[PDB]
Design an enzyme around this catalytic site. Structure first.
Site, short mmCIF file in Angstrom:
data_model
loop_
_atom_site.label_atom_id
_atom_site.label_comp_id
_atom_site.label_asym_id
_atom_site.label_seq_id
_atom_site.Cartn_x
_atom_site.Cartn_y
_atom_site.Cartn_z
N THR B 1 0.82 -1.20 0.00
CA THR B 1 0.00 0.00 0.00
C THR B 1 0.86 1.26 0.00
O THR B 1 1.74 1.42 0.84
CB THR B 1 -0.95 0.04 1.21
OG1 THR B 1 -0.19 0.08 2.42
CG2 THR B 1 -1.85 -1.19 1.21
N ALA B 2 0.59 2.15 -0.96
CA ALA B 2 1.29 3.42 -1.06
C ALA B 2 0.42 4.37 -1.86
O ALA B 2 -0.16 3.98 -2.88
CB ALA B 2 2.66 3.25 -1.74
N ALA B 15 2.72 5.73 2.70
CA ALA B 15 2.63 4.28 2.56
C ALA B 15 2.69 3.62 3.93
O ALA B 15 2.91 4.27 4.95
CB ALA B 15 3.73 3.73 1.65
N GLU B 16 2.49 2.31 3.92
CA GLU B 16 2.45 1.49 5.13
C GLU B 16 3.86 1.34 5.72
O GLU B 16 4.85 1.83 5.18
CB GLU B 16 1.86 0.12 4.82
CG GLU B 16 2.77 -0.73 3.93
CD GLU B 16 2.07 -1.95 3.38
OE1 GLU B 16 0.85 -2.10 3.61
OE2 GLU B 16 2.74 -2.77 2.71
N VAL B 126 -1.01 1.91 -4.80
CA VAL B 126 -0.19 0.81 -5.29
C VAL B 126 -0.07 -0.24 -4.19
O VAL B 126 0.32 0.08 -3.07
CB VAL B 126 1.21 1.29 -5.73
CG1 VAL B 126 2.17 0.12 -5.76
CG2 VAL B 126 1.14 1.96 -7.09
#
Lengths: 178, 183, 174, 175, 176, 181, 184, 179, 163, 180, 174
Positions: B1-2, B15-16, B126
Site C-alpha cells: 500500500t502506497a 505508505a504502510e 499501489v
C-alpha cells in the site's frame, strides 16, 4: 483463533470476531464463540460449518435433556460431537473446534478435528494465529486471571497474524454463571 | 500500500510500514517510503527490490547532477527509472512504484510497473490495499487541494486500507513536498 | 457489487459481463420480498432461483404459521438452503436486509451458507473499493435517505474503479 | 482499443486512455496514442512495450532523417518497425500496433503484430474491444469520407467499445 | 450468432445458418432460428442441445395451453425454460439462447445462459460473432424503431459478423 | 490456403488474402502471395515468418545474381531456402511454403516444411483448407494443361476451400509464372 | 469416409470398406454401409457403435412398423436416431452418421453427430477423408442430377479421398435409394 | 518403410515414395531413397533430416575422396555417419537409416539409429510398416539369393507393407547395387 | 498373437503359448486357444467359459445348434454391454456352418468383422505380413497348417511378447 | 544382458546379440561384446553409447600405451572409463558396463554405471535379464573354478535369461593369462 | 517371493517370511504360505489381501466339501475376477494333487489361471526363476526339489531387497 484455558474454578473460552476470505475482510463482527445452556464451544475455520454445528448440537442437547431430564455432561457431548464430525468423513465439516464445560467430575476442555478426534488438554488454541497464541500460553489459576492471560495471548495473535482481527469475545464457564 | 496525491504546487506521498511473508508478520517497522534528495519515491511489493531501486536511483541521480550542471527533472528521473526497470524484463524487479516530485513545469506524480510503464496521473495507490484506498480517493477528489488537507485525505484512505486489507497495517509514513522544502 | 447500510438500505449494480464482454446493460441484481429485500453478486442464475425459492418458502411459512417471518428465520432458512447443496454450491454471495420488531437487521451470506450480521457491507468484484468509501464515512446514527446518498457515492466509486461493475445502479429503501 | 480510419487524403487515429491490470483500474489517464512527426502511432497491449517502441522508433526516425537527408516514408518506417518486432521473436514485444501516416503515394494505414506482420487496410481496430469497434466501422465505412466526419465515426465506434468492453471506459483522444 | 431487436410494435430475431466443427464447415444450411407459435427462439452453441430445447419447449407450451385454459405468456415460458436449463446444471445444455415474444404487457426479449439465468434487454446478440454484432447494434440503436427498419439493422449487424467471424457466415434467417 | 499447379506452359500460384487470429478476422486484405522477380512464392502459416522469408530470399537472390552472372536455378533457390528453414530448427519458422519458378530444365514446383524438407510435385496445396482444395485438384488435374485453364482450375479449387474452410476468405490472389509475370 | 448425394430422383450413399486401428490396417473388408430395408445408412467412426446402431435401429424400425400400421417416414426415423444418440450423452456412441431415404415429401438426407444433432443437407461427407471428398462435391455438384450420374460423382470423390487420406482406401459400397427399388 | 536385402552378389535397397503429415497425404512422390555414387542410402522419418543427411554425406564423401586419393569403404562411411548422428544427441536427426554398399571385403548393409548406433545385418526394414515387411522377409530369407530374385522379394514385402500400413504405399523406388 | 486362416472346407486357428507381464515371462505354457484371442488372459479365460455356458444354453432349448454367426453376435453383445469396463481382449472366432466356413474378428468394444485371414495381438503385424505374401483363396487344410506355422514362426523371431 | 565370471586363472565375459526398440526386434545380430587388446569390455543399454565408448577407450588405450611403453593395468583403464563416464554427467552415456582383464595383480572384473561408479566384484550381470542371470550365478559359484567350466556356467545363465527375458535373445569371450 | 516346483507326483511350495513397507522392514516374521487340507496356497503382494483370500477360500472349501484342485482354482479365479474394479492386489500360487496327478497353478489379481510346473512370483521372482531354469528336470524327487527351492529362494534373498530373513516351506506329497 480461539483459546481455552482450564482452571480449577472453571473453563475460560475466547476467540476472534473477524472473517476474511482471501486477502479481504468481509466483516469486522463475525461471532466465533457460542454459548448453549451450561457449555461453551468456539472454533475456527469456515463459519458456516461452525454455525451449523452450534445449531445441530443445540438441538441434540435438547434431545437428550428432554428425554432423560438429566442434563448432559461434557464428555457425553464431546463423544456425540466427535461422531457427528466423523460420520461425514467423505465431506468433512472444515472446522477445528474447542469444546468447554464443567461437570461433576470437574472442569473439562476438549479439542476436536474435522475428522472428529477428541483430545483432552488443559490449554489450547485453534486457527490461524493459534501457533502464536499457544506460545504465549507456553495448573493453579483463577477464572479472571486466566481471562487476562487469554487477553494477552489473543492480543499477541492480533499483532502477528494477518487473519485474526479484533472482537476478542470472552466467555467464562463456571457452573455458577452464564 | 502506497498513496500519492497531487495538489497544485505540491505532491503528497504516504505508505504502510508493515511486512508480512505468507500469513505471518515478520516486522512491524519496514520503511516503504524513501527520499532521494530533490524527490521522493514509495512503492509496494518485495522490499529488497524497492530498497535496491532506491539505492541505484540515488546513485544515478548524483551521476546526472554531477555531470550535466543541470538538476534532475522528475520526467528525466522517471524515464531513467523506466529504462532501468525495462532492461531487466526477463527477470523483473517485482515492485510497483510511485514517483513524486516537483519541477518548474509543476507538480508531477508518476506510476511505475515492474515492466517499466510510465503513467501520468493525479491520484494513485499501489499494492495490496490499493483497491480500497483508491475508493476513498475516488469519493473525495478535487483538483484544488492544499498540502495538509491532502495529508488528512491520505490518512483517511490509508486508515480504510488498514481496516480492510490483511497485508497492510500498523504504521503510516508521510513525505510532504511543497515547492519550497521537502520534509 | 452490492451494498447494504443499516440505519436498511440496499443497492447494487445492473451490469453483467461474461469474460471480458458485456452481454447486458440491464441485469437486475436487487430483488424485493415484501418488507424484505435481498441483493447479491456472482452467477445470476443462482441468485434468481434463490429469490424464487425464498419467495415460495416465505409464502410457505406465512400461510401455515399465520404471522410475518422474522428476518433471522428467513436467514437461517436461507443458510440451510445454501448449505444442503454444499457438493454443488450456489455460486453467489448474498446480502439479506429487513426490519423486524427487534429492529433493523442486515445479513451476509456465503455460497457455503455462513450467516454474518454486520452494519455495513459490500459484496462482489468492486466490493473492496466500495467498502473503502463506507469505512471512511459510516457511523451508527444515520437517516435512510442520507444512507441512500452514501450508497450512491460508494457505488459510483466502484463504477469508476472496477471493470466488472458500472452502468446503472438499483437502490432500495427498507 | 485503438482505431484507425483511412480517408482518401488523410488518416485518423484514436484510442483509449485507461489502464487496468487484472480486474482493477490503476489509471484513468494512460496515453496510448503517440506522435512521431508528420505521422503517429497508437497500439494496445502492455504499456511499457508500447512506450519503448514509440521512443525507439522516434530515435531511428531521427536516424534516417539525419543521415539520408530525406524524410521517412510511411512504408519505410513500417518495414523498419516490423524488423524491430521480428528480431525479438524469442521475447516478443507484447503489443499490436497501428501505424498511420501520409506519403506522396497517399494516405497509408498499417497493422502490426507482436511477431511483426505488416498489413495495409483502410479501417482497423486493435485490442480487447476491437471486435466491438470494428463492428461499428463495418456498418458505416465508405471509401469517400471527410476528416471530421471520420472523427465522429471514431467517436461513435470508440463509445460503443466503452459501453460493451470492460477494459477501458474513459476519455478517448483523437489523432 | 443470433440477434434480437426490441421495437415498440414487436420483436425481430435473426441468426446464422452455418455449422462448423473445428476448422471445417460441415453444413451451409443449419437452422438456428425456430418458431413455436407467437414465440420465436434462436440461440447458439451445440446444435443438438438447441434442437432438443425447441422440441421440449414446444411440447410443454402445448402442455400449458391444453391444461391451463388460457394461452401462455412469454415470461412464463421463459421462467419454465430457465428451470429446464437449471435442473440440468450438472450436465448443462451447452447453449446460450434468445427468447422472443409479444404479450399483452408488450414486446419482450430474453437472454438465457446454459446455467439458466433470465435477462430482459432491448437488443442482444449471442454466440461467436456476437461481440462484433452488438457493436453494430450499439452504434445506432433507438428505442423508437419500426419492424422493417429493425430488419435492415439486423441485416447490417449480421453482415458485419459474417465478414469478421470465422464461425458465422452466409446466413439469411430473419424472424419477427 | 495456397495452391500451385504445374503446367507444360509454366507454373501457376494462387492463395487467400485473409488473416484471422483465434475466431476473429483482423484483416480482409493480407497478402500471402509474393513475387521475387523471376520467381514467385506463396505459403501459409504465421504471416510474419512468410513476409520475412520473402524479404530474406529477395536479398539473397540479389546476392547470388550479383556474384555469379548466372540466373538462379529454381532448384538452387529451393535448396537455399531449405537450409534457411533448417538452420533455425530450434525455433522453426512456422510456415509451410510453395516455391514456384521456371528454369531451362522446365517448370518446377516445390513444397517446403517449417523444418525445411524440399518436395518436388506437380500440384499442391498448403494450409488450413488445403485438404479441401487438393480434393478439387485430385478430381480435375492433368499433365497437359494450359496456363489459363490452370488459372480457372485454381479458382474452382480455391472457391471450394472458401466455402468449406472457416480460415479461408474471399480475397483471391493469382500469379502465373511463365517468363513474363 | 462416407458420402451422400441428394438427387431429384433419390438419395445415393457410398463409403469405404477399410478399417485401421492406429497405423495398421486390420481388415480390407469392413462394411460401413448398411441397408435397413427401403433405405440405408452409412457412417464413420468406431465400427462397433455403427454396427449396434444398425441393429438397434433395425429393431425399432420393426417396432414402429408392426404397431402403427403406417410405414416409416425418414424424419421420424431420424428424430428417433437423434434421441438414441442423445440419451447416451455421458457415454457417446463415437460415430458420425449419414441417414438417407426417400419419403412422399421427397428425397431426404440427414447428418447425425455422436451427441445427436440432426442436419438436413443435400450433399455431405463424414469421416477422415470427408474434407477431401466434400471438396470434389463442392466443385462438381448441381441440384439437377440423375441417379447414375451422381453415382459417378461419388466414385470420383471417394477416389480422391482414397488417394489423399491415409485412413480410407480400397473398396467402395454404393447404395442407390429410390421409391421404386434399391440398388447396390 | 525402407528395405535392404543382402545377397552374395550385391545389396538391394527399396523404400516408399509417400509422405503424409498427420492423417493427410501431402505428396504422392517424395523420394526417400538416395544414391551417393558407388553405393546408396535410404531411410524413414522426417524428410528434411534425411535430405540434409544425403547432402552432408555426399559432401564429406567428396571430402575423403579428394584428400586421400582412394575410394571409400562402406564401414568408414558408416562410422562417419554414426558420428554425425551422435554429435547431435541433444537435437537428434529424427530419422532411422539403412546404409548399403559393396567393398572389397564384400557386400555390406547397415542400420543406423537417430542416436547413431551402427548395426551389421543381412536383411532389415525401417519405418512405419517395417514390422509387416520384415515378416515377409523372415518367411522368404536365404543367404544364397540372386540380385533380381531379391528384387521380387523386395516388391512382395513392400507390397505387403502397402496393403497393411496406412503411412506407406503409393509407388516404390528400387536401385540395385551390384558393383 | 493368434492366427485364423479360412480354407475352402475348414478353418484353422493357431496361437502362442507364452505369457509375459512387463519384460518378464511368468509362464512358458499359457493356453490361448480353446476360439482364440490375445490380450489379458483372465478376460479371455472367462469369455471361453461364459460363451461355453451360453453355447450350451442355446443348444439345450431350441432343438438346433448355434450357427457361428449367432454365437458371434452373442459374443459381440457380451463384449458391448460392458463398454464402461471393457473386457481387454481382441478375439478370433472360427467355425463351420452349413453356409460354409466362417471366420470372425472381435474387438473389446464388440465389433464383428468377417475376413479370410487375420492375426491379433503383439506380433500380429508381422504374422499378417506373412499371410499377405503367400495367401490364396484355394488352399488345403494341411497346407494352411504349414502357412500358420511359417507365419507364427516369423512372429516368434521378430516379436518380444510371443514365443 | 551381459555376464562376467571371475576365475582364479582368468575372466570370462558373455552377452546377448539382440537389439529391440520398443516391442519390436530390429536386428538378430547386434554385437554388444567388444575386444580391445589384452582385455575386453561388454555392456548393456543404448548401443550407440556402448559403441562410442569402445572406440574412445580403444583410442585412449593407444594413447597411454604409446606414451608410457606399458600396456594398461585394468585398474587404470577402469578409473579412466569412470572419469569418462563422469565428466558427461549432464548428458549421461546411458549404459551400464562390465570391464574385464587380467593384470599381474591377478584377474580383475569391474562394474560401471552411467554416472561412472567403479565396483570390484567376482561375478556380475548387467541389463534387462541380469536379474535372471545373476540367479543362476548365485546358485552354485565357487571361487575355485576353471575357465571352461565357467564358460558352461555363462551359457547356462545366459540361456536362462533368454527363456525368461523378452529383451534378450550368444557371444562369449575367454580371457586367461595371455591367450584370449 | 514364492516358488512352486512340480515333481513326479507331488507339489512343493515355498515362500519368504518378510514384510517391508516402503524402505523399512516392519516384521521379520510374516507368513505368506498357508495350508488348506489336501493342498495349500502361497502368494505375494499385499498381505491383507492374501490373508483374507486364505480365509475366504477355506470357508468355501468347507462349503463344497459339506474336492479337486482345478475346481478350487476356477473358483479362486472367479473370486478374483468378480472384484475387477477393486482387485485383490496379490499374485498367487495354487498347488495340490488330484487323482489326475500333481497340479500347480498361477493366479493374477485379475484372475487368470495358468497350469505350469516351476514358477516364482513376486519381487525376486525374476532371480528365483533363473535358478529354476538352470537345473530343470521333469523327473525330480520331492526332497531334491526342496533343495532346489532353497537354492532358488536363497539366490532371491541375496539379490532382492524385498525378500529374505525367514523361509517357510510346505510339502504337498501328503
Amino acid at each position: 483463533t480461539a483459546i481455552g484455558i482450564k482452571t480449577k474454578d472453571g473453563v475460560v473460552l475466547a476467540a476472534e470476531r473477524r472473517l476474511s476470505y482471501g486477502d479481504f475482510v468481509l466483516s469486522k463482527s463475525a461471532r466465533k464463540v457460542f454459548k448453549l445452556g451450561r457449555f461453551g464451544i468456539a472454533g475456527a475455520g469456515i463459519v458456516g460449518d461452525i454455525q451449523t454445528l452450534t445449531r445441530i448440537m443445540n438441538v441434540e442437547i435438547k434431545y437428550y435433556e428432554m428425554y432423560n431430564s438429566r442434563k448432559i455432561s461434557a464428555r457425553a457431548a464431546a463423544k456425540l460431537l466427535s461422531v457427528i464430525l466423523y460420520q461425514n468423513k467423505v465431506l468433512p465439516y472444515i472446522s477445528e473446534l474447542l469444546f468447554g464445560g464443567v461437570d461433576e467430575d470437574g472442569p473439562k476442555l476438549f479439542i476436536l478435528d474435522p475428522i472428529g478426534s477428541l483430545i483432552e488438554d488443559s490449554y489450547a488454541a485453534v486457527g490461524s494465529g493459534a501457533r502464536v497464541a499457544i506460545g504465549v500460553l507456553e495448573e493453579s489459576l483463577t477464572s479472571e486471571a486466566a481471562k487476562e492471560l487469554a487477553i494477552k495471548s489473543m492480543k499477541s495473535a492480533v499483532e502477528r497474524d494477518v487473519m485474526s482481527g479484533d472482537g476478542i469475545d470472552i466467555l467464562i464457564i463456571n457452573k455458577n454463571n452464564i
